[PDB]
Amino acid sequence: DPRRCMRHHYVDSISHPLYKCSSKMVLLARCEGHCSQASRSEPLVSFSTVLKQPFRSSCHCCRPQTSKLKALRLRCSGGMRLTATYRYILSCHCEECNSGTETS
Amino acid sequence: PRRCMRHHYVDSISHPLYKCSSKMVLLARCEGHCSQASRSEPLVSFSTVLKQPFRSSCHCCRPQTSKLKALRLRCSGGMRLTATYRYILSCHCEECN
Ligand SMILES: [Cl-]
């Protein structure tokens, strides 16, 4: 299967959203693809004194499995040094939509 | 065919805490493969701008509309206990969050 959950590389320029700084081009990684598992949702039955959520669901999303934190210094007007930080995704995997993970 | 779709089925319902005679009910569920790829990419944080590590997108086959329904169970001692559930009328692909 070629369209499966996969790591893809790309480049983006990192710039501060408010301060007009010295933007920098960086190589980044993202997770992308189609998880093989179908997503589903079915009703849960409630009874007297036994209340449950209306639906029980399953859904798999292509998300980061491992990553490495990186930081880089930008140069801004006129001498300000700002650190920017982001995760460099090392591997991807399919995981439940509602998993309690940092991506959730 | 494999798209996000309504599927019908029947299930036997029993009260988990009370002795009741099971009852068969017609149910609907959502199931399928949403067309959109799911993805997750990093968010850039700065010294005073603290963000989640990732920005993600993911589509799930879930109920779009539904109807609350109810039925009377027959239980021990001529007791009638209520059970309730949502009957899914339509399905669609929706963001995980
Ligand atoms: Cl129907």
Residue numbers in the entry:
A (entry chain A): 35 to 138
B (entry chain B): 36 to 132
Article sentences:
Norrie Disease Protein (NDP) gene encodes Norrin, a secreted cystine-knot like growth factor, distinct from the lipid-modified Wnt. Unlike Wnts which have promiscuous interactions with Fz receptors, Norrin specifically binds to Fz4CRD, but not to the 14 other CRDs of Fz and secreted Frizzled-related protein (sFRP) family members. The Norrin mediated pathway maintains the blood-retina and blood-brain barriers and regulates angiogenesis in the cochlea and uterus as well as neuroprotective effects on retinal neurons. Our crystallographic and solution studies further reveal that dimeric Norrin forms a complex with two copies of monomeric Fz4CRD.
We determined three crystal structures of Norrin, using selenomethionine-labeled protein for phasing. Each Norrin monomer comprises three β-hairpins (β1-β2, β3-β4 and β5-β6), a β7 strand at the C-terminus, and four intramolecular disulphide bonds. The two monomers assemble as an elongated, head-to-tail, dimer stabilized by three intermolecular disulphide bridges (Cys93-Cys95, Cys95-Cys93, and Cys131-Cys131), in agreement with small-angle X-ray scattering (SAXS) measurements which showed Norrin dimer in solution. Superposition of all molecules in the asymmetric units from our three crystal forms with the MBP-Norrin structure showed an average root-mean-square (r.m.s.) deviation of 1.5 Å over 190 equivalent Cα atoms. The flexibility inherent in these regions is consistent with the relatively high crystallographic B factor values. Conversely, the structural comparisons underscore the conserved nature of the interface at the dimer core.
